[PDB]
Amino acid sequence: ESPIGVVVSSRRNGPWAELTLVLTPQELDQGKRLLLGELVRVSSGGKDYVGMVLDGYYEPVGRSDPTYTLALAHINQVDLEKEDPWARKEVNFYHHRIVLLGRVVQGGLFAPSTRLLPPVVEARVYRMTEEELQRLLAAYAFGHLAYGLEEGGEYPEVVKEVDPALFVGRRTANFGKTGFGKSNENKVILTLLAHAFPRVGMLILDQNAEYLLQTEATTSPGLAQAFKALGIRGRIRFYTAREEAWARRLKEHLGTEWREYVEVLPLKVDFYHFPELAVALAYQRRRLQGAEPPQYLENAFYNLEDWKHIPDRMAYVYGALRKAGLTPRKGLKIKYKNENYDISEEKSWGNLQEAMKGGARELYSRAKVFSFLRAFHAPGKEANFLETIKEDLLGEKTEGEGKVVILDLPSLGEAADFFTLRLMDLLFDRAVELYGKRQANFLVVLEEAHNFLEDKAGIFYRVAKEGRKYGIGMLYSTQSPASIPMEILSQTENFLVKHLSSEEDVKVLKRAKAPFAFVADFLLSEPIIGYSYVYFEPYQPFVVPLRVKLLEHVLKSLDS
Amino acid sequence: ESPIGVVVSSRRNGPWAELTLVLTPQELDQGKRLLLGELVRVSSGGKDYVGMVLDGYYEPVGRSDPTYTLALAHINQVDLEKEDPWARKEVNFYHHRIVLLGRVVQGGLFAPSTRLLPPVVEARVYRMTEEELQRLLAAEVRTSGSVKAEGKRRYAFGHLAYGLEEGGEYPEVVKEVDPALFVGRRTANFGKTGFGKSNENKVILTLLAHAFPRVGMLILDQNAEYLLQTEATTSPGLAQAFKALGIRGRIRFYTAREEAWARRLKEHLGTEWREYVEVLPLKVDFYHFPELAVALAYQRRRLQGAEPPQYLENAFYNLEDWKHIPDRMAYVYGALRKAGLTPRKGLKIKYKNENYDISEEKSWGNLQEAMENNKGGARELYSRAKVFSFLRAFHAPGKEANFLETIKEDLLGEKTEGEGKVVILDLPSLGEAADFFTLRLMDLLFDRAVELYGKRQANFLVVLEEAHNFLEDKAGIFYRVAKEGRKYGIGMLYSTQSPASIPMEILSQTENFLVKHLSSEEDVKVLKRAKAPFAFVADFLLSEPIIGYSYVYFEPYQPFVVPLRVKLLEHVLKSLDS
DNA sequence: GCCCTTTTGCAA
DNA sequence: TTGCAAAAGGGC
Numbered sequence A: 001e002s003p004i005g006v007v008v009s010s011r012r013n014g015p016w017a018e019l020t021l022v023l024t025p026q027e028l029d030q031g032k033r034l035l036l037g038e039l040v041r042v043s044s045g046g047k048d049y050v051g052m053v054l055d056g057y058y059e060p061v062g063r064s065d066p067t068y069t070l071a072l073a074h075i076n077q078v079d080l081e082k083e084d085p086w087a088r089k090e091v092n093f094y095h096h097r098i099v100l101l102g103r104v105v106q107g108g109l110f111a112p113s114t115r116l117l118p119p120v121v122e123a124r125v126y127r128m129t130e131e132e133l134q135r136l137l138a139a140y141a142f143g144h145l146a147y148g149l150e151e152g153g154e155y156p157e158v159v160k161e162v163d164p165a166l167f168v169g170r171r172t173a174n175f176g177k178t179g180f181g182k183s184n185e186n187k188v189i190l191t192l193l194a195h196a197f198p199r200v201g202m203l204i205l206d207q208n209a210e211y212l213l214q215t216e217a218t219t220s221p222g223l224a225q226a227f228k229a230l231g232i233r234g235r236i237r238f239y240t241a242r243e244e245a246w247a248r249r250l251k252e253h254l255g256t257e258w259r260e261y262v263e264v265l266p267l268k269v270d271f272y273h274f275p276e277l278a279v280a281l282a283y284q285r286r287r288l289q290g291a292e293p294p295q296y297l298e299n300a301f302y303n304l305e306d307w308k309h310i311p312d313r314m315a316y317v318y319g320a321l322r323k324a325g326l327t328p329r330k331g332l333k334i335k336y337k338n339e340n341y342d343i344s345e346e347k348s349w350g351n352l353q354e355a356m357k358g359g360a361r362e363l364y365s366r367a368k369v370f371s372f373l374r375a376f377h378a379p380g381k382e383a384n385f386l387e388t389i390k391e392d393l394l395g396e397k398t399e400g401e402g403k404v405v406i407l408d409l410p411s412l413g414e415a416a417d418f419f420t421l422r423l424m425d426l427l428f429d430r431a432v433e434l435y436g437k438r439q440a441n442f443l444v445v446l447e448e449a450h451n452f453l454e455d456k457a458g459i460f461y462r463v464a465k466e467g468r469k470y471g472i473g474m475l476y477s478t479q480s481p482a483s484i485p486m487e488i489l490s491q492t493e494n495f496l497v498k499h500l501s502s503e504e505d506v507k508v509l510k511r512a513k514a515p516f517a518f519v520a521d522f523l524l525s526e527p528i529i530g531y532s533y534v535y536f537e538p539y540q541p542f543v544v545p546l547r548v549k550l551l552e553h554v555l556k557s558l559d560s
Numbered sequence B: 001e002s003p004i005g006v007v008v009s010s011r012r013n014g015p016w017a018e019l020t021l022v023l024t025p026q027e028l029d030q031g032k033r034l035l036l037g038e039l040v041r042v043s044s045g046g047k048d049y050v051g052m053v054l055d056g057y058y059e060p061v062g063r064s065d066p067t068y069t070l071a072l073a074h075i076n077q078v079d080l081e082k083e084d085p086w087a088r089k090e091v092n093f094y095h096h097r098i099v100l101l102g103r104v105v106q107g108g109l110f111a112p113s114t115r116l117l118p119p120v121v122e123a124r125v126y127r128m129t130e131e132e133l134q135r136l137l138a139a140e141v142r143t144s145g146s147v148k149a150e151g152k153r154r155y156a157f158g159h160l161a162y163g164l165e166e167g168g169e170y171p172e173v174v175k176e177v178d179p180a181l182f183v184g185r186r187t188a189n190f191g192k193t194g195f196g197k198s199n200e201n202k203v204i205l206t207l208l209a210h211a212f213p214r215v216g217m218l219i220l221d222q223n224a225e226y227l228l229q230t231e232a233t234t235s236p237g238l239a240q241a242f243k244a245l246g247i248r249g250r251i252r253f254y255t256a257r258e259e260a261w262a263r264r265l266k267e268h269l270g271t272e273w274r275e276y277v278e279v280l281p282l283k284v285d286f287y288h289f290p291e292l293a294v295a296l297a298y299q300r301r302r303l304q305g306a307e308p309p310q311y312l313e314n315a316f317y318n319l320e321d322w323k324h325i326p327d328r329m330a331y332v333y334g335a336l337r338k339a340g341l342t343p344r345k346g347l348k349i350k351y352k353n354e355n356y357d358i359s360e361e362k363s364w365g366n367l368q369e370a371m372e373n374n375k376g377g378a379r380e381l382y383s384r385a386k387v388f389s390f391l392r393a394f395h396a397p398g399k400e401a402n403f404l405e406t407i408k409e410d411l412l413g414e415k416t417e418g419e420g421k422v423v424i425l426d427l428p429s430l431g432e433a434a435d436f437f438t439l440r441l442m443d444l445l446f447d448r449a450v451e452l453y454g455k456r457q458a459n460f461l462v463v464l465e466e467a468h469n470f471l472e473d474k475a476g477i478f479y480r481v482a483k484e485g486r487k488y489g490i491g492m493l494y495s496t497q498s499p500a501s502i503p504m505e506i507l508s509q510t511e512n513f514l515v516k517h518l519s520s521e522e523d524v525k526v527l528k529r530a531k532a533p534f535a536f537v538a539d540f541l542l543s544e545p546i547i548g549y550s551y552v553y554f555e556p557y558q559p560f561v562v563p564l565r566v567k568l569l570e571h572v573l574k575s576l577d578s
Numbered sequence C: 001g002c003c004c005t006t007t008t009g010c011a012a
Numbered sequence D: 001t002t003g004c005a006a007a008a009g010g011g012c
């Protein structure tokens, strides 16, 4: 209820205003202290500012020689707190430096910095109450305010809550050394969003096989286990090429009713049912590559729909698929001229090949251009998982349904990169096509993003630049700010930063966002696991230190 | 009418003169404060100078220990406002640093900086009044001993402001701009996304349209925000502004979603929207324009390297002569049909002396039979028809428009010369071909503009978004336009959001600058290097993310950079409506 | 990483 | 017989 110290000086140091505070022997003897990085209230001219404690140093006050006095007391062996109160009362001062960050105005908005420097005689500094801190953070907890690991510097009641307005339609970056909590942070945010706001969809690109089932003691549990614990049914769609191994695994950990929580789907299709899909994939593979699809590929890409009415034209497409190595289902009848062959049988295949046009004959001749499709082909599938995912995420059925689509990238081997690029392109094109009718309203979860946001001409770069218009959020983790382009870093809205050991990383971070210049020293020298610095635009344009929650504790606590 | 404080020191710090001001306890207790960046009047030796407040700090005055005094007062709960006047009067001081920018002489001439250093005993500092600020914002550099121009009409662009501080806004002090500044010159609109770029771009375009009705515009609308109000805000677009001002028959909107855009135009402008905007398609019918198809197929190979094939190179140069020979043109039409383009229903091709209808399969088969059962390069073109398949994306039957030629006529036509048209291009609807078509259109517009040098000036303004994407390439048409377009009367207004990515050659020769909040350090550093006057606002621009707050600088005769809160289009329309 | 150089088929 | 495409290795 009273000022902590006395303000004795103030100035403008660069783009910020700073002031000097002095703590007296009485206040120090009452146990009053100020922690570095602590948030305080500054009253000046009838206006309230938020301030941060930056520095602290000892300096003599008045006419005194603290060194001589203390050395003499030590030499003569006098207990300074019991024999010489007046000697103890002339050296027990302490100095602090406080920077003004801005002030809260009108409807919770933040006015940054200031043009008015406060005179010393009329400036006061106050300890901030939990109600004030709660208002500061607010205008399903994910973390709570903390200062380092000091006792008394923890505020379990001051929390930052998850809210779809914070994440959907906006870009979030998750940085930190390996082993410090990026994946746990992501999973806690996603579980809270799924539990509290069930109309938000997620597209998780799982490259390490950890976001569905995770039983080893090296990470937090998976989303399937979290959803089973919280009683969330029928919201996970898992795509994989190991649909039998994963089905076996799910039954040991989710029990006999695992199908109520997870739906396993294959990443394989029958290309004798989707020749247009085969041709489109072969055509797009080269655009995603350097450049210049061939003329015989553009011709097919544009005219295969026309060809479908001509059995002679379609016979050459099926022959190209069969010659590239794709296995047909037993009893597949191909009609040529005035005869029907069974390509599944070697004798009929040879007969038709010997017995065998708008550009389809060139496609048949250059059949080895389809061999890569054999990484996706499986006879008897007839699914088109690309379209299946498209209506999972952007289907008109939703208008708010909630769909967590998890892609098991490793199972695809060396086709995963091409598959990811193609799927992202399709989803973004559909989202653009639906503009003005419905919003996408889903979040792309992207780990090790430095492999996706490198080239400016990439679909992921384009999504990061233009997803806010169409309602697509992005949440990307990289372990190192220096791995991300500065153009993306500067345009990112939300930041969640754990410990970074390198000076270059913190320099890049503060070069991207100025307010991050006040925590670089803490980041460099405090390796604490699960301790985050969070920054949100435009309502919390300043860094706040949060202690993040374990997913196990969150699950055990949300049952109440 | 009294000095704010007392001047205690003066010197020169580099290319500028500076002085030190002290605010005493009596002034500080009356509420007198100086804001950072505020402009003040400095009187010295009978001359008046303009100064700006740069810094502020606390320093002891005389013999006194403020720390000990204030600590002793604090430990006794002494209120240094009603209890210890003597203790308060010994510590209540404050220091400020003020730079001398120049002075106003004669009839508004601005003399920059000064060779005289004011002595400290007779120098006085005064808070500037609104009338003085109004007269100061109108001063500019002039030759010498000459009379002021007495130029054309001027319009309010924004009003003076000093951040977000209370008492820092001066709604009666407005910066008036002559729209001719934007005609034939380069304008840079830097800033973060969502901070006012679109509003000020629309204000500039509306002022140009109202003041100079003979100047045309070519807007490459990437975000689709210049025609109507987007479904995220309610700021009127160019079409609604032109309806409000009663400007008729000037907007030509090219798009591939004519039905949706016509529905929106109806719902927003009423039932007479056709009197204000004309909607045209972006798709061509290549049976009406086989020369366009041949040119596209020929130039696609060239722009990617390697010599084009002989048959394509021959067709490019001889298709106009082939038009008089139906037997030779039938092969071109057959090549298009084989490539797969869809003909308009009822199309007829005359081969030999027989008339066929390629829109029907039986007739098409008959024509194919007759064609094979050396007419220049036409037969070689027909044999290799698969070179035209890529046109299926750009083709639509029954158009007979050729937007590429229509836009060139609109912008550089003799009949349409005068009362310049406002062409707006809906780039998103083009999909992947947007950049290709934009570059082609700009090239074929620059060529015609250079050709017409002597008979008629180009006289149109190019509106480009995310300009760092196109201005990076020094071999590009947009870089060439930025460098050379002034000679042919072609202006450029570009917004980037990342000035560091724009070459210093372009930055140094830009005339108009409007800068909003910039998050990155490199962007601000490049700005300071490019223009010296932007050195006094670098700290503000980096740490003050304020929406609608801009720093403006118009070359070459503006003294210093002016911070403004810019007027909204809604209010500008009312102002022009009175 | 990118820009020549070759064998091979399809045509007319 | 030669021009044109298309895939692939080699030189820079």
Ligand SMILES: Nc1ncnc2c1ncn2[C@@H]1O[C@H](COP(=O)(O)OP(=O)(O)NP(=O)(O)O)[C@@H](O)[C@H]1O
Binding pocket: A176, A177, A178, A179, A180, A181, A182, A183, A184, A185, A217, A218, A219, A220, A479, A529, A530, A531, A548, A549, A550
């Ligand atoms: N908030 C937390 N509180 C306590 N321990 C935590 C917290 N977050 C993470 N941990 C511990 O850190 C371990 C690894 O967490 P993890 O989420 O995998 O970090 P990470 O950033 O993803 N490492 P990596 O993905 O390899 O770069 C967990 O198994 C926990 O023991």
